Design a protein around this nucleic acid. Sequence first.
DNA 1: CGTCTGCCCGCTATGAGCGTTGCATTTATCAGGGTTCTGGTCCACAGTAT
DNA 2: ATACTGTGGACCAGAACCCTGATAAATGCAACGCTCATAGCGGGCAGACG
Lengths: 209, 390, 105, 310
Amino acid sequence: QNGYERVQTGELETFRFEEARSTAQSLLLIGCSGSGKTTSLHRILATYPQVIYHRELNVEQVVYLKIDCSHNGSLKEICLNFFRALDRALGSNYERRYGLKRHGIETMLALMSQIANAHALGLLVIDEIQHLSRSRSGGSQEMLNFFVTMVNIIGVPVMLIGTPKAREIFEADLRSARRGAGFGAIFWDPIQQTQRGKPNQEWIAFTDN
Amino acid sequence: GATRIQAVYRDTGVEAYRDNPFIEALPPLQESVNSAASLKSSLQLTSSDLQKSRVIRAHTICRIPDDYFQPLGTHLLLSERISVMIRGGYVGRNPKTGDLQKHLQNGYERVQTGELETFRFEEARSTAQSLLLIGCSGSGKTTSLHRILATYPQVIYHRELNVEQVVYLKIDCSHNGSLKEICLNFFRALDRALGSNYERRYGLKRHGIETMLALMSQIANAHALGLLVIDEIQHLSRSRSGGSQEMLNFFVTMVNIIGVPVMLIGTPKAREIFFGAIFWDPIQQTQRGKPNQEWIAFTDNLWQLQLLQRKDALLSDEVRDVWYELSQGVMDIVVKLFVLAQLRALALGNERITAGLLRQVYQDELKPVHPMLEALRSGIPERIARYSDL
Amino acid sequence: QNGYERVQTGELETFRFEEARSTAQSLLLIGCSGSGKTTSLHRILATYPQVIYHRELNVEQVVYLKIDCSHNGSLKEICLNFFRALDRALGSNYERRYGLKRHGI
Amino acid sequence: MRNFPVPYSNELIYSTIARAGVYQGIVSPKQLLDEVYGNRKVVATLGLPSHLGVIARHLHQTGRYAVQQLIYEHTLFPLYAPFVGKERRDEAIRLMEYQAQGAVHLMLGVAASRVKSDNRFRYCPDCVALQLNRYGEAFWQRDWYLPALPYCPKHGALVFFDRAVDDHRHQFWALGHTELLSDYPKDSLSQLTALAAYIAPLLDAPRAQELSPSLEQWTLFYQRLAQDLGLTKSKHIRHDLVAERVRQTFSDEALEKLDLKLAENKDTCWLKSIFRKHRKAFSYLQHSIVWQALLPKLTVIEALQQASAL
DNA sequence: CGTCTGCCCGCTATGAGCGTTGCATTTATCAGGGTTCTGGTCCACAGTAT
DNA sequence: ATACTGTGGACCAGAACCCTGATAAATGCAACGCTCATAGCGGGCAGACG
Ligand SMILES: Nc1ncnc2c1ncn2[C@@H]1O[C@H](COP(=O)(O)OP(=O)(O)OP(=O)(O)O)[C@@H](O)[C@H]1O
Ligand SMILES: Nc1ncnc2c1ncn2[C@@H]1O[C@H](COP(=O)(O)OP(=O)(O)OP(=O)(O)O)[C@@H](O)[C@H]1O
Ligand SMILES: Nc1ncnc2c1ncn2[C@@H]1O[C@H](COP(=O)(O)OP(=O)(O)O)[C@@H](O)[C@H]1O
Ligand SMILES: [Mg+2]
Ligand SMILES: [Mg+2]
Ligand SMILES: [Mg+2]
Ligand SMILES: [Zn+2]
């Protein structure tokens, strides 16, 4: 209010009011099956306590969350694993209240944004993203937009784990490839026995131990 | 949700902007000096935070994409046009001399009869205009609309009346061309900027599509909404049966009859469905046979944010050329590539940015966006037609 | 055929065919209690066999019917006594077919 | 409710609530009662409403509107306050805040007369045109809704029409100009218009709040006044000169229309009971007729000053 | 000239959105009593004619 | 100086809105069926092989 009055009386030439946070950081990890795309995540995120309780506030900060995609390729079954996986980390129930059938996909996408900042959730990991290709629920452009909308709403960083078959889903247009490779795209390869003209020092250290 | 700024009325210098509480309480119209200095931002880069550890110097360097903004030539025109169409949309909606009470009285019939052309007064006109923004992905359509519309206070409160004027509102389109989920995003974005319950009483009562198209535009006049922004209008291409045209007829009845200004944003794939239009393009290195002044300024202002100990103040022409070659003009790619190269340099330990390092970072960590950049690089229209959004 | 559009429109005077005509008479019997109105009526009506089944047609001619007004006098318990008394003489389920559905008067 | 209209100048709060319903497209009356009030068991009343206090809380951010201001300036309270007394007036003001419609009506005289006198909506042809010209809307006004006179103070007659308050007891209705008027000639009695113009300034007068003479004050004031006119026998009334004066001032058709037809033969009468000791507070209209028939050189506020002094 | 390999394509299953439906809740309706308001009443008080 | 009459005041009850109770009818909402878009399977039918 002081800034507003000063700029209105001409004393202060310009002033900046409240701003809105931009799009959430997104990462895409793509590696052939059997390389350890789930064991690595469960051994890296295990050093972070999941649910932290704050005394001066009243928020149970859920540091991370790991959900998995559906085999149908459905889009109301990946907005509902969110509630079913927030129920196994906390104690309260959410699929009973927010998991009805009257609510559409967009409404289920705008109620997983209030309980995404009510608890200061830190990461959202979606596993096996390859299952969404060729689903009977909707076309190929009803989900390439669903990811864009979901990234643009929730605001928590999103991590996607998938198979090199799922690269073709995200290399379809510049919007989805820009958002999917938001903070770099990590690609995993099998260990090679030798690099250049010398034996590798990773295979030997992985075998001799 | 949003901070309510108590209004104080200035003295406008325009005859038409005479006694409106709505446009005599907005911040003063800035000038060309303030069109290029009220948007600039940069990282602090304190010299005390360059000798720190690698982890601190690598966490404080990832804030460059969020906190860096450099206004180009196009932002001046965009700011002027938005200013004109947000200040001129209230003169036909005067609340003093009984002009807004003639726009709210008509809108009750449209809620009752369900037809959006049942005027009760014929002396209440509309004075709003329309804009259309189209540009390649990563050009800056949103992050240069959240810093040009951020000099206005949003929710203002006028105590001479009881009105709570909402200066601007932003919504985005549904993931399909849905019908009842564009009139629900309006309520979900209006009741989290006022702390009210509009979605729980407009829509939960089992209304039709016509009643939810009339109630939305009535509650958008109960609060003197100044500008309505819809992001990603290309989501209407995959609409339901008839949705691709009913909503585009509504978006031309709202600005023409009801009088609320509307602005639309979309990728060039949204030109098929079609409003004064503004087209944005990636920065071109050569304008008139010489390097672009805007591009030179952008590069030389980005280069002054470097946490590498062995940094080079002088920017090489070869380095600039290969940066443009690997970026192909999109500002998002430019900034992201700079940040990724800086992080990889810190990781390796060699703390000087090289053309080879730039190429390695590109080839290793920009795999998904490769074909679009290569299509823009080739410049063949046949290759451009598929993807690259140009 | 005329009676179907009375059901559809809801007005009991919308007759479609002009050639159709009504040939009926009305009567009321009033007497002090103990005169013997009910049993006299039953003795008179016992001569007709009620449900006569025609063979060349398929109609079951109900010669007569008897109902009594409800104690409440309600508008819904006098149009249901007719259905309750039309299947106690035929063996059908007219009440379950018509009464149970949500219908106005 | 996030945006409650400020009442216009000289308006009934019923019209303010109806316009609040109009401005947001709340067609359903139950939804309107839920949003504005919170309970579905309220009665839409014109003149002496209740539940103010949740209306004055919607306007709380506007500094200039408090409960007393709505009670006095936007409800028909100033037409009962000077006559009922002091304790009844204070109790009624205390009860307008809370949720009791019955008690507020019981405390006041004709509010307890349990009849809604001419409950149909009224309007004035010429006033609506002025309101459309100046404000741009059309609202109910305190001038039209006089307790007993079906007449605008300045213009001729109030053009009635169908519908009423009690047809739907939970709905607020706001006038629309599409029913502006119907052109049919109507003429008004001169003395009745004079009475309306005499009683109108009592509405817009700050001094009517604190000038409420008590019952013994009323009877002593009328006794000394009647003695000063000289028509008073020893502890008796002439019962002829007063009737002659009031018949000269107001004609028989008027007294039929306002429902105070004289019965000089009958010992009990509205005019006869005033001379005797007052038992209960009489309506404003009876006092208005007495004042205008006896002495026309003093206004309503001057009469209140003289009554309150001694 | 028949067939047996690709191409049609008829058909089964599935999910999201919309329209439909029956139960519990709310709303409305009517009878009975009551308690203070009032409507008129009778009696005492006072002013007066024989 | 003493009986007759007009009038104000204390005063019986009639009654009318409010409260309570039971009974019948009108919605809101949670649950269920209808419709359309989409992907795929395998059997039957037009061109090439013998
Ligand atoms: N003029 C600019 N100067 C500096 N950075 C910019 C500029 N324009 C855009 N950016 C950067 O680009 C990033 C992403 O771009 P932005 O979010 O504006 O894209 P967009 O137009 O919304 O894209 P999409 O096509 O996906 O809708 C921003 O976070 C910002 O850092
Ligand atoms: N004509 C008659 N001859 C012989 N017995 C008769 C005659 N009329 C009446 N009764 C006798 O009187 C009684 C008639 O009872 P019923 O209930 O029919 O009479 P009601 O008073 O007309 O009836 P409702 O209850 O319908 O008014 C029977 O006991 C019957 O035997
Ligand atoms: N870095 C590693 N060192 C040792 N074992 C590993 C490593 N990465 C993966 N594995 C082994 O691979 C097995 C399968 O990994 P898994 O979690 O299934 O990965 P994915 O889901 O990608 O196949 C695990 O049982 C684990 O023991
Ligand atoms: Mg796995
Ligand atoms: Mg955007
Ligand atoms: Mg009988
Ligand atoms: Zn008037």
